[PDB]
């Protein structure tokens, strides 16, 4: 048969195995699919179910890697359409629209076109268009969406009061192609041939107040209706003056520059200016305060640079301070944590959003999910920021969960056997872990009797006893060891001037005192001018 002859083919085994080796590359997913369709070339109800079920799990597994590929949700419905189960064709537009969070234009355009043919029920088919326009109606390129909706009113409905009702909306929206909708309004106004037909435009009252024309004017109507049109056509023209300013602004500033409106892939790179306009076009859209138009213009700008985090931050920043909805900002980053490839600038911010929201059981669970990622060796990571953002937030929980074991109600912070051993294992790497002294400088911060005696013995003494070379030549180390002692509230000035100068200063080697002295002088030059001579003679 055709199925088993494709498994025993060579090219199937290499193209599959390539995809399982390099998942996110896409151009192997694309070859795995473009090949497997052609190998079943007659793709009708005829062809065998093992070959169709296999070509269904290619698509449905491939869209689970790349949820922002508008065309492959269309192309997967049409394959489910031709094969002939429109139940399963709807289900995979629903799953496509939910991927974009209901607000992508190409899906709702190439859903409704299909949806005309198969709904076969009046009230429900217009309910698809009402639900559509509240998400994707203000989309700047939505011009061609409405032209579908106006095609389906004229064609279908009898009354011709909905066609005027809808077209009154499109006149107020800054679409790319708006002039095609003013041309249709002006082709109606001219063809109005009785005074009763001006009621379908606007109410009987608002005609007589705002324009002063009356429908019940019985008389010689010809010139009166020829006046009504001239008076009514004017306030269209003033609206065409309003919108045209808003369009020609947005076109000339923003939309002219943006050359790419689609996804591509995780290996695609965007131009620098294109990022520059999307950052400004988003700030402009926030100014207008049209919430439907704002959410849409983030989503519309997200899918070209969905991998950066640069837009995931702002879209959460807009939601957090302007619209004042913090629980909603938590959901953006969680939806952003998946697509972005930096993942660090988000996850620092995302921790902080949970903390303000008071969902600590989630965050403690989240820190378990990031230590489990490295297999309990976050300590051993190369990129410091993931560790350091982990550590200070891991600290905040264990101050809270465990009661303090020191005097003066100080939360035993960085000093706990659970965390300190992670830090000591981090310090032991010495030359390769590459975030050493920054970790070391935050160990100084304790400023009390018990904790200074701890950090002296448990790190600053043991680092001398083992006597690693790297830490003793770096003057940032000796500077921090002095500042641990000097700011202790327990010592008087006498012993604090003794303990440093009598014991700490002499423990350095004379060869290291070349490169240590610059950073060690700066401590001395600012806090100990009196004993600046006794520094120099020693070295």
């Amino acid at each position: 048969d055709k199925y088993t002859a494709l498994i025993h083919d060579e090219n199937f085994s290499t193209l599959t195995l390539n995809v399982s080796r390099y998942p996110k590359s896409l151009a192997y997913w694309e070859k795995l699919l473009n090949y497997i369709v052609k190998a079943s070339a007659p793709i009708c109800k005829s062809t065998e179910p093992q070959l169709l079920k296999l070509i269904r799990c290619t698509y449905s597994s491939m869209l689970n890697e790349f949820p922002y590929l508008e065309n492959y949700y269309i192309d997967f419905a049409l394959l489910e359409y031709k094969l002939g189960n429109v139940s399963m064709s709807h289900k995979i537009f629903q799953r496509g629209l939910q991927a974009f969070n209901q607000r992508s234009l190409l899906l709702w355009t190439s859903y409704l076109k299909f949806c005309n043919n198969v709904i076969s029920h009046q009230k429900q088919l217009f309910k698809k268009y009402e639900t559509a326009e509240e998400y994707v109606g203000l989309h700047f390129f939505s011009g061609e969406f409405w032209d579908l909706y106006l095609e389906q009113i004229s064609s279908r409905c009898t009354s011709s009061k909905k066609y005027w009702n809808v077209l009154r909306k499109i006149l107020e929206i800054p679409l790319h192609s708006f002039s095609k909708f003013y041309a249709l309004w002006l082709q109606r106004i001219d063809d109005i041939m009785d005074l009763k037909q001006l009621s379908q435009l606007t109410s009987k009252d608002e005609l007589l107040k705002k324009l002063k024309i009356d429908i019940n004017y019985s008389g010689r109507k010809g010139p009166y209706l020829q006046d009504a049109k001239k008076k009514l056509k004017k306030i269209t023209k003033e609206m065409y003056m309003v919108v045209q300013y808003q369009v020609l602004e947005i076109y000339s500033i923003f939309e002219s520059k943006i050359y790419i409106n689609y996804y591509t892939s995780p290996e695609t790179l965007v131009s620098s200016d294109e990022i520059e306009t999307w950052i400004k076009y988003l700030d402009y859209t926030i100014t207008l305060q049209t919430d439907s138009l704002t959410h849409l213009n983030f989503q519309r700008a997200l899918l070209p640079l969905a991998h950066y985090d640069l837009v995931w931050i702002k879209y959460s920043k807009w939601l957090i301070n302007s619209k004042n909805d913090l629980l909603g900002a938590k959901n953006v980053l969680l939806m952003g944590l998946k697509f972005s490839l930096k993942k660090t600038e988000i996850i620092k911010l995302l921790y902080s959003v949970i903390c303000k929201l008071n969902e600590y059981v989630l965050l403690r669970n989240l820190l378990e999910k990031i230590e489990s990622s490295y297999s309990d060796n976050v300590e051993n990571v190369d990129d410091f920021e993931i560790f350091w953002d982990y550590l200070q937030f891991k600290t905040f929980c264990q101050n809270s969960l465990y009661s303090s074991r020191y005097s003066d109600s100080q939360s035993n912070g960085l000093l706990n056997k659970e965390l300190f051993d992670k830090v000591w294992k981090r310090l032991s790497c010495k030359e390769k872990k590459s975030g050493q002294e920054i970790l070391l400088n935050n160990l100084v911060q304790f400023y009390s009797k018990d904790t200074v005696e701890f950090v002296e013995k448990n790190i600053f003494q043991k680092i001398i006893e083992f006597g690693w070379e790297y830490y003793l030549q770096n003057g940032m180390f000796w500077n921090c060891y002095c500042r641990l002692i000097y700011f202790d509230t327990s010592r008087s000035y006498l012993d604090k001037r003794q303990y440093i100068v009598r014991k700490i200063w002499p423990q350095i080697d004379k060869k290291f005192a070349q490169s240590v002295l610059p950073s060690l002088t700066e401590f001395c030059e600012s806090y100990f001018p009196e004993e600046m001579d006794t520094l120099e003679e020693m070295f």
Binding site: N116, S120, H121, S155
Partner: protein
């Protein structure tokens, strides 16, 4: 529409816009599988043939089929037509009027004008040999000339040459009518 697999160009094909799809309405008649005429037809029972006697005593004499008597009038009239023909066929060796010399010498002449005479008949038929006799036949019921005659020639070869000539020649025109000739037949 997009594709338009039709003879016309794209403008004309987009001109025949169909009304939108028919609304669905849940059906009211019976499903095509379940459709059937009334089964369980209880046959012409013995109990039915027992209840015939209530009908039979009520209408014991059936009404007379008088429309059938219009057909029994005509078909019996056609049989009586044959009997009047049967009265004629019993009555030619008798007639006296056909009972002179040899029947191989006798011409039949027919379709002759009602208003011929035996002398004009004699002129024409004497064209084909010497005549032994004539007779025009006249209706014995009233002497309308019947439009036939019998002509006895002195020789049967002159009778058959008269036959040749003046019947198969379209019918001999005598006065103003086209006169078949035959041999005697009778």
């Amino acid at each position: 529409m997009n594709y338009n697999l039709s003879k016309y160009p794209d403008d004309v094909s987009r001109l025949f816009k169909p009304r939108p799809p028919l609304s669905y309405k849940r059906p009211t008649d019976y499903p095509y599988a379940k459709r059937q005429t009334n089964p369980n037809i209880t046959g012409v029972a013995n109990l039915l043939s027992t209840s015939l006697k209530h009908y039979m005593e009520e209408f014991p004499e059936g009404s007379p089929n008088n429309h059938l008597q219009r057909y029994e009038d005509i078909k019996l009239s056609k049989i009586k037509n044959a009997q009047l023909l049967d009265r004629r066929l019993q009555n030619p060796n008798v007639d006296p009027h056909i009972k002179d010399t040899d029947p191989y010498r006798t011409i039949f002449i027919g379709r002759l004008p009602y208003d011929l005479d035996e002398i004009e008949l004699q002129k024409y038929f004497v064209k084909f040999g010497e005549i032994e006799k004539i007779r025009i036949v006249k209706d014995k019921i009233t002497q309308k000339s019947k439009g036939y005659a019998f002509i006895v020639f002195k020789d049967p070869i002159s009778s058959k040459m008269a036959f040749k000539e003046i019947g198969v020649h379209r019918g001999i025109q005598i006065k103003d009518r086209i006169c078949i000739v035959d041999i005697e037949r009778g």
